[PDB]
Swiss-Prot record, chain A:
Protein name: Circadian clock oscillator protein KaiB
Consequence when changing K35E: Disrupts circadian rhythms in vivo
GO MF term list: identical protein binding
Keyword Cytoplasm: yes
Record flagged with keyword Membrane: yes
Documented effect of changing R67W: In kaiB2; shortens the period of the circadian rhythm to 22 hours
Signal peptide: none
HAMAP family with a match to the protein in the record: KaiB (MF_01835)
GO cellular component labels: cytoplasm; plasma membrane
Membrane topology note: Peripheral membrane protein
InterPro entries: Circ_KaiB (IPR013474), KaiB-like (IPR039022), KaiB_domain (IPR011649), Thioredoxin-like_sf (IPR036249)
Further comment found in the protein's record: 'Kai' means 'cycle' in Japanese.
């Protein structure tokens, strides 16, 4: 699950995020999910959650996801950071 | 100049409420007069510039809630509670860069 | 869960080496003196157990290095550059170590 | 597909024994005969170059085995359960011919 942390939502931002959702939906079944949270509505980080810098995890991501992320972080200037924990599977462990 | 090997307490906030700023100046003040030298408060607002630096990261507030002393415990728990402004924080030893704060 | 803490720094290593084990000793010490209750240090020799568990992952070293404290960054740094033995690394929350993880 | 977008199955492998290379050769072969223009196999021996590139990550086996073909999964089941050689795997996407840039 790709966790995005954003500062507010704009039209272009929402469009690009729905596009990102669409891509993880088209070519990433059960291997990539998306959780976007707005820091303008939810600043309080809780428990295991954390925020890493964009160039930290972007370089290791798929390149269309890389171009979408790069867009969000450079053009729209709304993405503050991301996190990929991810504790991924279909059946809960900890979690 | 110096106790040296200073702790760098980076706080990550979203906006500056009229009361939040005074709480900040308070925190800074007590860190200066009561913990002279050992600390260094670095305030970072996400809203002023969203894009985090490559060296920056944000940890949860319940973490780093056993390390720091109590008089700033209350201020941190507050900056999380009364005003929903505090996202998270980080604590670094350094120093990698210079000319930052004299 | 409990003992609840802390942020665990997993180091992925290709074989045990005198210099490497000395450096890891040092790193563990630093982590348990300054950043006690903040950073744990977990070594994994890939030569002993190459198979990653379902939860584990290996991010590249120059990925999470940058966001780590300088005293750790230098050790990991030479651990990759000076005497090349370090594979990737990772940073997770929970759950214990040494105790250790079971 | 505009006009071509190819899969890049990266296998993170701990050393190269005698009898694992024939299974990799075979896997490669079936990746080229049944499928084609899709599954591009890239094998990274972590023992020849411990230093993971910044573009590289290593994930758990089943986590990506979710989307893999049955014969391929039989072969990775082999490499992981038979001789402890497969550390992990990663799946990238790209138009690779001709594109050394990657």
């Amino acid at each position: 699950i790709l966790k995005l942390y954003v500062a507010g939502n704009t039209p272009n931002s929402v469009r690009a995020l729905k596009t990102l959702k669409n891509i993880l939906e088209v070519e990433f079944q059960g291997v990539y999910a998306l959780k976007v949270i707005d820091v303008l509505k939810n600043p309080q980080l809780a428990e295991e959650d954390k925020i890493l810098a964009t160039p930290t995890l972007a370089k290791v991501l798929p390149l269309p996801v890389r171009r979408i992320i790069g867009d969000l972080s450079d053009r729209e200037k709304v993405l503050i950071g991301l996190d990929l924990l991810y504790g991924e599977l279909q059946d809960s462990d900890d979690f």
